[PDB]
Structures are given as C-alpha cells and as structure tokens.
Amino acid sequence: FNLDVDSPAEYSGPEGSYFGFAVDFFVPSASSRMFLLVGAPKANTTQPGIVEGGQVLKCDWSSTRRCQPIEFDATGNRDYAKDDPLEFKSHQWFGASVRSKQDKILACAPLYHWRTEMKQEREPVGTCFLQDGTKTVEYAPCRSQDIDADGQGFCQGGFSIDFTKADRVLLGGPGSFYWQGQLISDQVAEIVSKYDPNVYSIKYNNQLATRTAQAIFDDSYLGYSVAVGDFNGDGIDDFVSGVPRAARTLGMVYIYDGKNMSSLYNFTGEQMAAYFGFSVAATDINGDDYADVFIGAPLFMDRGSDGKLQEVGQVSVSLQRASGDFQTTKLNGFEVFARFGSAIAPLGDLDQDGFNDIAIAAPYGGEDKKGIVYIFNGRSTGLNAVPSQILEGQWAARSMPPSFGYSMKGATDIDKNGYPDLIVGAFGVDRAILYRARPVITVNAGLEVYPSILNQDNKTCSLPGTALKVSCFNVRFCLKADGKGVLPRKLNFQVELLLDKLKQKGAIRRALFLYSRSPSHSKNMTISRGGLMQCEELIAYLRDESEFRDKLTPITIFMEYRLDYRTAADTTGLQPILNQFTPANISRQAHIL
C-alpha cells in the first residue's frame, strides 16, 4: 500500500525491441552505486552480419536514465570452415532472462541456433554470457557432443535461470529429451576458470543435472521456470522448477535437493490445460524462517455462479512446515482472460512489519487490457488474500498489447530509504518502470490521561469561570508517532480539536470553549519520533443561554491526524505514508461512573 504511483521513474528502449522482457537490479557493493538491468531480446546490435541479436541495457537511477548496453559480446558468427558458419546469432533473443548477484550478471539467449559439429544443422541449444566484474565468460552446457531432438539439441538452455545463494547457477532447458525438460546447476567458481574461447563442449567438474526419463514424459517442459530456496533444512538452496504440461497437461512442480539434485517434493495441478507451474517464486511470506512456495496457473478456468466457466487464473500458496508438510491455499484472479498469476515476485518487506511480502501480476487485465499488478502482505498465519494495492499500467497498445506486468523484480532498496523497491516491464511498448516504497509511520492516537473518568458525584476540580457545579471539561488531545527508516524528526502532524465531532455542526452546542471565542478549536502539535504524546489541553464549560436545542448533548470530539507531507518529504521527494491499518480517529466517551 506504500508503493508510490505518484512519481514512477520511467525508462524506454528502442521501438519494437521488446525492451523490458526481463528486469533486475545491479548493486555492486564495491562501487556502492545502484543500476537497473533490462533485457531487449529483439534489439539490434553492433555485431557484424547479425540482425536482431539482443541487448542487456544497464540503466542508471541517480537522475540519469542513460541506458548503456552491456557489451557482453561484440563478434559475429564463429565459423567451422570456409563459408561454414558454426553458429547463428541472428534472432537469438539474447537478454530474455537477466539475473544479477551482487557482482555478477547472467544474461542468456534461448533461441541461439548453431551448426552442430557432426553435420550441418540448426539446433536451438542456447547460450549464456556470465560477466564477473572485468572478466566475461560464455556458458552453454546444452551444446554438447551428444545432441539432437533425442538429446539436448533442442535444449533452449537459458529459458529460465537463477542464482543460488552459494555461488551456483541454476539453468533450465525446457526442450531437451524431446521436450521433457532439464535443469542444470553449476558453480561460478568453475564457469570462469573453465572457458577456452576455442572449445565448444566444456566439461565442468562439479555440475549437477537431471537426466533422461521414459518416453511418456515428452512435452512436459521441465525448467519452464525456476526458483531457489531452502526446503529440507540443510541450509543450501534447493532447485524449484515448474513443469506446466505434466500429467496430461494438469501441470506439476518439482523440487530437487540442492546438494545432489535428488527429488524431494512434488506438487500437482487440479485442472487440465491450466498451466500449473508457469511461474514459480519461493519466498518466506509468514515470517516463520521457513520458505514458502508460490505457483502460477494463468489459464485456470473457474466455475461461475450460474455454472459457466471463466478463465481467470489461480495462484497456489503453500506454507512449508517444520515436519515436511505443506499447508496449501488457492487464490483466484479477478478479471476473465487476464492471465492472473503470470508473474510472481517476492517484494521483501515492503512495509517493514516482520513478514515478507509478494506481488502477482495480470498482464492482460485492467482497463483496456493495459495491465494490472496486485500487492499482497504477509501475516503470522500466512498471506493475506486481499490485495492492499493495485498497480496499473499507463500505456496504450501500439501494435501488440502493452503486457504491463510480464516481468517484475523487487527486494532491493535503490533510494536507500530503508524500504525495498519494484521495477516492472511493459515490454509491449518497450518500457520499464520503477516504483519507490514510501516510509511508513505508526500514529498512536491517545485518549487516556489521569484522571481517567469522572463518576459525576464529586467535582475533582471545578473550572473557574463557570456558574455550574460541574468540574473541568478536559478536551486534551495528543498524536504520537514513530517510524523505521529515513524520516524527518519534526512530524508536522497538524491536528484539530473540533467541538462535538459526534454531533451536528452549524449550531451552538451546550459546551463551548469561551476562551477560544467559539466552540471550534484546532491544534498544530509537532510530534517527535520516539517522544511521549504531546498534549494540547483545552478547557470548555457549559453556560446558560437565552435559547438552545437542549440543555446538554453528549458527543465526543475527534482529534485529526492529517499531514501535508510537504515538509515530511525527504530530498528525493518521497512523502511518508500514514499506515491505513490504524484508525484515523480516536477519542474517549463521557460516562457516569
């Protein structure tokens, strides 16, 4: 609810280049600066004799939006013999998957056909370029000595990628072994040290991969999407991948042990042709130190009230428990044909409460099918199934739908305001957008002070200037505040002390603050973060009048906690957000005994 849609940081690539197909963050702690990372799988390049190679443009955030393409590779097609090209880089969709560790970048090309060594062929094995600081390497474990449609010739390696926390690269090839799929894990500490620019089939000593299965598993598409997270308590991240056509197109999801690639747990869809496993994201959503699985089924068809079916999509939330079980819950989409559940990305702690958060996108939903992203918040139980914020795309479709929400990333604070951020890619209009999370303040409106209440039998202190036998009518207000991150000390929480907020205005109530010349009142307390409640005591008394509506009227007075945010905004211009969960008004009631 705190992501700022008032000032989104914009970005733009070349027209028709699918800019924003894959997004990420670049945070090299050595240089202490923050960079985006956007892929453009249809971009033109400088490479000679290559048309539409692909670019990974590194875009800057610090007031300069200059997107400078990373020169992962500059050459053309290497050759086997005279007029016998070895590889075909044209239309290779490079940069369709961009992942960045603190000091590494891994961008892959899935549609990289090549002329196999044995015979003149065109096999879409795919390849990846791992840039590690200064050194740049090439990673292509699916172009090997044993390739064909039978083998991993059609591997399309690099369709999905991720980094393990222990310096490994998890790579997923959907098409190997007649489209059964494959996952491959290998450590960066060996990718760089084993790279001969004149060798194609490189054998990596400590690589882990999944092997061939029976012919009934064809067209399973294992590796269509990958993710990592510890799932058996060893501490090493475990490879979670989505296989969206297993079990007669029901969809399944596999989890493999991250130490030896041994199967641990399985999931399974419940509807045919629903794409269970299209998107997978493993986060810790309830804050119990156990990672929780999320699975997307964009094409799920859901029964309507009358019985008609609607294709709305569905996301499965599965909370890992300490004994090896999973408490699963469903979560359905909101608009028909919107493909809810296309993309899932953990957000970190978007509002700094203690439970990590998550966001799910519906690229073809929204008004005029521009796109919508939904923001979810964790709790001690689990996910909170009602979205707190709806993020909508602002761009019309030029030729194809804007697809706002196809890819997204979070969990890194780029403002360094303490809170994580979010970038979104609407690649159908060649754009990317950055959103900033505003700081959250908890106002604790107070209505308790000594003396607490009066039994009306005895006047503790009769107010001077009143002819009645009643005591003083204290209308003391307060507004306490506190925060977590970058916040100005002097909260200008402008308040009000309007008389009889539980009664009709426009008339003179039986109680009026005469010293204020009118019943109406106000406050301008400037609270401090961490201080005590700042009391603005007010005094009013009941006076005899010529005529009135009645002798007395019990109505409590509401103290406002409104802010301008104009001075609360820091240098970057990001106003603090006031937590909407806490009540906006508070007071105490008048009672006898």
């Binding site: 062929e121 065109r122 067209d219 045919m272 794409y275 094409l299 294709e311």
Partner: protein, 349 residues
C-alpha cells in the same frame, strides 16, 4: 418468427429486491439440413488414415439421407506452426520435413482451407483423393488454432445459418496449448479474428494459439457443434476436456478405421438428442436462475439441461430473473441451436 425456441423475445420490468419468471420452450425440429466439415490433421503421424477418407463420400451420404433434409461436406488440413522448434529450419528440411526418409511430403502449413461446403459428393471425393501429408518434429500438433480459424471464418468455409453446423476434427494426438508458443518467441495472445487471405492461415506464425476458454467462446458464438474423432490413446485426453468445452462430442476411431461413418452418424444422433442452455449476461446485479423441466419431469439445474430428447417432444426451461442491485439485456440460447431468445430486460432504479 422463431420456430424451435419459443418465446424468441421477452420484455420484463423489475425493481430491486424482486424476482420474476416465465417459461421458455425449446421444441427440436424433425429433420435438419446438415453441413459437415472435415478439419483433418494431415501430419506425418496421420498418414495411414488420410487414405481412409475415400470411403466417407457416398457411404455417409447414404447413412445420413434420413436424418437430414440435405447434406453438405467440406475439407481442410492443418499440421502446426511453421517455426522452430516445431519444424526444422534447415533449408533442405524446412520445405519437406520428410526428406531424410525420401518421402514426397507436402510443405508444412498452419492451416489450409481446401473445399468450401458443397452438396456434390464427387467434388469431396476428388478433393480428398489428391491430398498429401506433411511433417514436423514435436509430438503434439497445432489443432486448436486451426479449429478457431475454421469456426470464425464464415463466408470462406461456407457455413449455412439454416443448417446444423457440425465440425469433425480428425486427429490422433494431443494438441498445442496457448502458452506453448513461448518457446518459439510468439508471446502475442490470439485476438480471435480469422486471417484466411488466400485460403491459407497467414498469421499462424505471429500470434500464439487460443486457450480453451477463447476457443469455447468462439465455437459457441458461431453455433458450431464439434465432433472430435481421435484414434490413439489420446481419445481419453480429448474426452476429459469435454466438461471444459460445452457442446462437444468425442468418438474413438479403432485401428481398422472402418468405424468412421458410424462414428459420425452416432455422434450426430447423440448430438440431436440433447438440449441445454446458457446465458450471456452483461448486466450488473441481475442473476438468472434456470431449472429445466425434462419430459421425465426431472428438476435439472438447466446448465446441462435435459437429454434424451426427440421430436414430438417439447422441452421447457423454467427461468427466474432476480433484481439484486441497480446500475441492457441477456440472451439465453440452447447451445448448438441456431435460434436464441432475446430477454430484453428493462431495469428501472
């Protein structure tokens, strides 16, 4: 005006918190002019079964001389999307995927319309006799995209509004799904228009397949009655999807394929012996309640309606319109039938 679905129109006024009702009667007619279309898979796997299309010309027209006033037939073929990794892109293999086996396979093609519906059975036999097979690599094949194209293009195929539109899809394997195209760089969703320019599906290679919901909507919009004729074990795959696709039938073709004319005729009889309805409501707050009154008196929930219907037999649908909240019309139609009832619901707030 309407002859089979009565009443054909209803004007009713409702006020919030109230419920109305009426009776909708569907009386199937005696004989139906039938228009049948053979959307035939001609991939390399379906090679042994194309030759068994030479018998369906006169035999079926003899079988269906009593169930129909007149008869029409048509042809058309599909294999797959013609991009990698579904086809090979080698210059020798791209235009004949069979060349590594010395076959005269036809170039692959997303979908080609061959013969528009004609009552000349000799034309159908001639069109079928000259037909070749093609090839590709993947195990599944792109049938659903061809189904959508055949359902939507009306004046090209030659459907009749006065007929009982039927569509036979002859295959032996599971079909491609919507998001399977992401492997080929096709990330553009299908728009649901049809793009036959020279009786060839031009846009098979730029936009992805349709999903089950979009396919079903396009089928029911155009009153198409689909009859799958699957051969291998994948008949079961095509059968378990029937709940997700209203108004569709799945038959099994044995190894001998002598059971094709019978498959069509029994499927047509089962199709004609059923009535069910749905409602396309786009109004706010109005919820429709429909219970069907079978000739055996059953109180079915209507969404699947009453089966085992014949002529000399009128089926009645009990409706109940509600008015829950304030701010158009809704049309309730028997799926597969050519007439719809237009409930011009007036609303006053």
């Amino acid at each position: 005006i309407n002859t089979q679905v009565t009443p054909g129109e209803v004007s009713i006024q409702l006020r919030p918190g109230a419920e109305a009702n009426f009776m909708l009667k569907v009386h199937p007619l005696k004989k139906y002019p039938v228009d049948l279309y053979y959307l035939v898979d001609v991939s390399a796997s379906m090679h042994n079964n194309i030759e068994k299309l030479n018998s369906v010309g006169n035999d079926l027209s003899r079988k269906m001389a009593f169930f129909s006033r007149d008869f029409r037939l048509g042809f058309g073929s599909y294999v797959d999307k013609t991009v990698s990794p579904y086809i090979s892109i080698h210059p020798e293999r791209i235009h004949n995927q069979c060349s590594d086996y010395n076959l005269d396979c036809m170039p692959p093609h997303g979908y080609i319309h061959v013969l528009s519906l004609t009552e000349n059975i000799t034309e159908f036999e001639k069109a079928v006799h000259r037909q070749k097979i093609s090839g590709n690599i993947d195990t599944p094949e792109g049938g659903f995209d061809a189904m959508l194209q055949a359902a939507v293009c009306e004046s090209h195929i030659g459907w009749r509004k006065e007929a009982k539109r039927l569509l036979l899809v002859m295959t032996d394997q599971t079909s491609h799904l919507a998001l399977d195209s992401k492997l080929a760089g096709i990330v553009v969703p299908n728009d649901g228009n049809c793009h036959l320019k020279n009786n060839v599906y031009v846009k098979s290679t730029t936009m992805e397949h349709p999903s089950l919901g979009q396919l079903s909507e396009k089928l029911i919009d155009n009153n198409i009655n689909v009859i799958f004729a699957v051969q291998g074990k994948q008949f079961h795959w095509y059968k378990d999807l029937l709940p997700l696709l209203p108004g569709t039938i799945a038959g099994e073709i044995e190894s001998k394929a002598a059971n094709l004319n019978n498959l069509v005729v029994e499927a047509y009889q089962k199709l004609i012996s059923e009535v069910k309805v749905q409602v396309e409501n786009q109004v706010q707050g109005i919820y429709f309640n429909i219970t069907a009154i079978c000739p055996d008196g059953s109180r079915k929930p209507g969404m699947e309606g009453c089966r085992n219907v014949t002529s000399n037999d009128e089926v009645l649908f009990n409706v109940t319109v509600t008015m829950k909240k304030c701010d158009n019309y809704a049309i309730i139609k028997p799926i597969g039938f050519n007439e719809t009832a237009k409930i011009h619901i007036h609303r006053n707030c």
